[PDB]
Design a protein around this ligand. Structure first.
Ligand SMILES: O=C(CCCCCCC(=O)Nc1ccccc1)NO
Ligand SMILES: [Ca+2]
Ligand code: NA
Ligand SMILES: [Zn+2]
Length: 368
């Protein structure tokens, strides 16, 4: 049936600035919010302002030393932390910016609050577009991510759920999440990503987990230019097999929008409909679902993607003609919600797609 959706957003989020030339723009979360408000989606869901996650919350995963450094580091005292910055990988991809810790606290707070809401059985779905920062490690920032809100949200879910399924549709491999749960069968991690001389360099299909976690990490490595047809060819069959074999009681879906056509950093060719079909596929399983953000660098397309995926979560049809909004000029020259794929070559042949799927199916046969 139609589901109860709780959505997390803090109006301050859009003001956090990574710095001149940095592609990660928290402003895209505000654009997403303003667009979905203008479509009238607030009438169908509960809108919550997340709390600022504390150090006690963050240290359920991250080390005390790393969190203390994030809590202390500022552009004014940077010069006194040169060594600490190199140790925790802060300074280039993961810059020090005003309000960095507070940005982490709000990104994390939405994911953790959403997980609590699902655990209490007070919502069917929880949405946190400021979350999904999949690369952060126990004691290290990485790929524009500092605090792993996903790992913290899954640890919250594990209090009430024996098995939690994690699915990652961002163009980049969900390394941080896969790493945290690599040796456990209590979380199965499933990542679809561009692989081969691409950030972060991990997610080979041969990386399948270790110890009790062997066969509980799934990687689908892809080439440049994947399209809606090819993605759709494998996503439903793989998720269906995962659901059948793994039988999770809760799901976390990372919806990184950098897998869309025309992304500033991405090299895929999905449309918003192709991306959102993933949400529709996961939705059909009727399991408690936490939907998260992630990458996404062509901000107009990020706002379109996450607005449509919120409408999909709500089973609410919305017009293709964009309503007026505070960022209306960003959506030109068309002013439409949906996007067209580019003429880029799809390097993922149908044979390649079927072969990787068959290899992953062999691995899934190894589950109890
Ligand atoms: O989307 C991501 C993170 C991608 C991180 C890519 C790191 C390399 C990079 O492009 N860094 C960079 C570029 C311009 C300015 C500063 C850093 N994960 O899902
Ligand atoms: Ca991914
Ligand atoms: Na695992
Ligand atoms: Zn990404």
């Amino acid at each position: 049936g139609k589901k109860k959706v709780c959505y997390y957003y803090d109006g301050d989020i859009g003001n956090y600035y990574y710095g001149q030339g940095h592609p990660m723009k928290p402003h895209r979360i505000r654009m997403t919010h303003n667009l979905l408000l203008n479509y009238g989606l607030y009438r169908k869901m509960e809108i919550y302002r997340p709390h600022k996650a504390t150090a006690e919350e963050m240290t359920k995963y991250h080390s005390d030393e790393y969190i203390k450094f994030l809590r202390s580091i500022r552009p004014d005292n940077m010069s006194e932390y040169s060594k600490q910055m190199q140790r925790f990988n802060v300074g280039e991809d993961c810059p020090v910016f005003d309000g960095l810790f507070e940005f982490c606290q709000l990104s994390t707070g939405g994911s953790v609050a959403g997980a609590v809401k699902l655990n209490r059985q007070q919502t069917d779905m929880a949405v946190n577009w400021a979350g999904g920062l999949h690369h952060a490690k126990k004691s290290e920032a990485s790929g524009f991510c500092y605090v792993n809100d996903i790992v913290l949200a899954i640890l919250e879910l594990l209090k009430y759920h024996q098995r939690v399924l994690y699915i990652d549709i961002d163009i980049h491999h969900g390394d941080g999440v896969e790493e945290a749960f690599y040796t456990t069968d209590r979380v199965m991690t499933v990542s679809f990503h561009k692989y081969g001389e691409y950030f972060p360099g991990t997610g080979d299909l041969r990386d399948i987990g270790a110890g009790k976690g062997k066969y509980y990490a799934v990687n689908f490595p892809m080439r440049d230019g994947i399209d809606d047809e090819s993605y759709g060819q494998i996503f439903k069959p793989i998720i269906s097999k995962v659901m059948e074999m793994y039988q999770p009681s809760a799901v976390v879906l990372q919806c990184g929008a950098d897998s869309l056509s025309g992304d500033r950093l991405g090299c895929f060719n999905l449309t918003v409909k192709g991306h959102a079909k993933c949400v529709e596929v996961v939705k059909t399983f009727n399991l408690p679902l936490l939907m998260l953000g992630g990458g996404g660098y062509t901000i107009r397309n990020v706002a379109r993607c996450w607005t449509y995926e919120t409408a999909v979560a709500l089973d609410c049809e919305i017009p293709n003609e964009l309503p007026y909004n505070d960022y209306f000029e960003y959506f030109g020259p068309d002013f439409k919600l949906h996007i067209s794929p580019s003429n880029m070559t799809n390097q993922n042949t149908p044979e390649y797609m079927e072969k990787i799927k068959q290899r992953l199916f062999e691995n899934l046969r190894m589950l109890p």
